[PDB]
Every structure is written in structure tokens, then in C-alpha cells.
Design a protein around this ligand. Structure first.
Ligand SMILES: NCCN1CCOCC1
Length: 330
């Protein structure tokens, strides 16, 4: 089997991408944030605290003839951005663009933090990192990709995020028309439960490529590109007026600037992030100071190849016996 679904940016800045997911019988369609940096499929629901729901579409398990309460199971997750959610668990039929998983764990939120409540366009998350990170207790549950894997024509999923435009998540196949040149595959460590790999280096605009090992995670659930301070300083030093602002919480730059591109290495291959992809607009409404799309990972503990980097590439998340990541220009 295969699945194919369109992913759409939630706003004019590509702050996040939402993909429609069918849950239950009859189908209840929710727009989920596909996240390769986490492993829980959770949704806003009929059980979520009323004051914590502000415009999201909710899953109502009582209206699904295939929903079964997973007895005694609870979940609770805290994300790197400080956001959190928790609740109970149902098993139900979940479909993504024609691909169906019966008995998928659907984690129903009873509580969500303010960051989730304020994003009316995100109805929940669909985790695509390794099932070892799944928070369901006392019986850990599998991701949608893990459950579909055996059935897929090829044990892979692909992320093709658009810049200011819709993109696609495919399951079980590689669309050879979606990229240019070849896909370069690179080793993955699953020790931390992430799609963790090692970039071979970087270039800033037309600058000379620096060969240097950058360990990081391919994370569709993180908006920006988080890299070592030395790398991020070398990037923003090419932008007149750019500076790291402690009050804003990162590098800001004059909105009148034309940003240089950023290249990252994948083996001998090179992915080029055009400069406009690094502009995240005014720091506050009406300001002429803009927020940078490349930020320091110093306070995180890990480098993150978020949407800023991934959207410049066709990315293969290869779930073969030994998982690998593939990158192609597009
Ligand atoms: N609610 C703050 C976080 N979100 C994250 C996704 O994009 C919009 C802003």
C-alpha cells in the first residue's frame, strides 16, 4: 500500500505545516502537525478542557463506532519549545491520504498548554520519530508509520515541504518526479529516538564550503534551523545590521535586507536554502526588525534541521532494518 497527502503552511511565514488526517468511523478529519521529532499521535478532543480549545477541530471518540478506550492508558508530553499536552488513549482507524491503519493509538488531550490553544489551525500532532519516544503509559504505543510499515510497498515516508506553498508527505513510495538529481543517503543514529544524522558542513551564500561534522536531527515539527553558535555567527556576520538580541531571544536583522543563502552538506552532496527561506518577518507587528530563520542551538543541547532546512530538500525517512535519511535538491 501507499499514502499521499498534501501538507499546507498554517500562515504566511511557514511557522508550521498541517496535513489532513481521517480518524474514526465515520471519518473525523483533523489537520495535524506531522512531526518527525516526536512519536505521539495526539489530538484536540471532546475531552479537552473547554477553556483550552480556541477554534481547533476536535476528535469525539464517542461518535466513532471503531474507537475503543485503551484501558488505563495515559500520555503526557513536554516539547523542547516549552509546550505540553496530556490525556487518555483510544485505538481507532487512522488514514493519511488513502493509507489506513486500524487500531492506531489516538491520544486524546484532556489538557493542552497555552501555545497549543493559541494555534487555532493545529488540531494535534502526528509523531513520526522512533516509537521508543512514545509517552503512552503503562503500555508504550507505536507511531502511524511504525504500524503501516509492513504494509507499505517500501518502508519509507517522504517529506516535501513547500516554501510559502503546499507540499506533500508520501508513505510507501518515492516520487521520482518530486526532486532533481539524485537522493544522497546518510547514516542515522536512533539512540535518542530521533532521525539523527551528521551533516558534512556548510557554506554562507557564495562562500567557500567548510567541511565540519554537524550532528543534528531531521525535525519537521521544528520551524527553524538550529545550529552551533560558531556556524550561526558566521551566517549573520554576512548580513548588515544583524545581531543577536537577548530581549527577542535570537538573531534579528533589518527587514530591508536581502539574505544570503545557506548551504548544508549531506555526504558529498549540497542542499541550498535560498536566503528568503531564512526571513521570518517582523519581530512584532509593524516593526522593521525581522526574526532570523537560522538560530543558535547552544541552549538546546542538540542541533535541529527544522523546516527551514527540510523545505529546501526532498527528504526520505527510510525505515528499513537500518534506518537512513535521504536528501535531494528540488
Ligand atoms: N503558539 C505559538 C507556537 N506556534 C507554533 C507553530 O506556529 C505558530 C506558533
Amino acid at each position: 500500500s501507499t499514502g499521499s497527502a498534501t501538507t499546507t503552511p498554517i500562515d504566511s511565514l511557514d511557522d508550521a505545516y498541517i496535513t489532513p488526517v481521517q480518524i474514526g468511523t465515520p471519518a473525523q478529519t483533523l489537520n495535524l502537525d506531522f512531526d518527525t521529532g516526536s512519536s505521539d499521535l495526539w489530538v484536540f478532543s471532546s475531552e479537552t478542557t473547554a477553556s483550552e480549545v480556541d477554534g481547533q477541530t476536535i476528535y469525539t471518540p464517542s461518535k466513532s463506532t471503531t474507537a475503543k478506550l485503551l484501558s488505563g492508558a495515559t500520555w503526557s508530553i513536554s516539547y523542547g519549545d516549552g509546550s505540553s499536552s496530556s490525556g487518555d488513549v483510544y485505538t481507532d482507524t487512522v488514514s493519511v491520504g488513502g493509507l489506513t491503519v486500524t487500531g492506531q493509538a489516538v491520544e486524546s488531550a484532556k489538557k493542552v498548554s497555552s501555545s497549543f490553544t493559541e494555534d487555532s489551525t493545529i488540531d494535534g500532532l502526528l509523531g513520526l520519530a522512533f516509537s521508543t519516544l512514545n509517552t503512552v503509559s503503562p503500555t508504550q504505543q507505536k507511531t502511524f508509520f511504525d504500524n503501516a510499515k509492513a504494509s507499505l510497498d517500501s518502508p519509507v515516508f517522504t517529506a516535501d515541504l513547500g516554501y510559502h506553498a503546499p507540499g506533500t508527505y508520501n508513505f510507501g513510495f518515492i516520487d521520482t518526479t518530486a526532486y532533481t538529481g539524485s537522493i544522497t543517503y546518510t547514516a542515522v543514529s536512533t539512540k535518542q529516538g530521533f532521525w539523527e544524522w551528521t551533516s558534512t558542513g556548510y557554506a554562507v551564500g557564495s562562500g567557500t564550503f567548510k567541511s565540519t561534522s554537524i550532528d543534528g536531527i531531521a525535525d519537521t515539527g521544528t520551524t527553524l534551523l538550529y545550529l552551533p553558535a560558531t556556524v550561526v555567527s558566521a551566517y549573520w556576520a554576512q548580513v548588515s545590521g544583524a545581531k543577536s538580541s537577548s530581549s527577542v531571544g535570537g538573531y534579528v536583522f533589518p527587514c530591508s535586507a536581502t539574505l544570503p543563502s545557506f548551504t548544508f552538506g549531506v555526504g558529498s552532496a549540497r542542499i541550498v536554502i535560498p536566503g528568503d527561506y531564512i526571513d521570518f518577518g517582523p519581530i512584532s507587528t509593524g516593526s522593521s526588525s525581522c526574526f532570523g530563520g537560522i538560530q543558535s542551538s547552544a541552549g538546546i543541547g542538540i542541533n535541529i534541521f527544522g523546516d527551514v532546512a527540510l523545505k529546501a530538500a526532498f527528504v526520505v525517512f527510510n525505515g528499513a532494518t537500518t534506518p537512513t535519511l535521504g536528501f535531494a535538491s528540488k
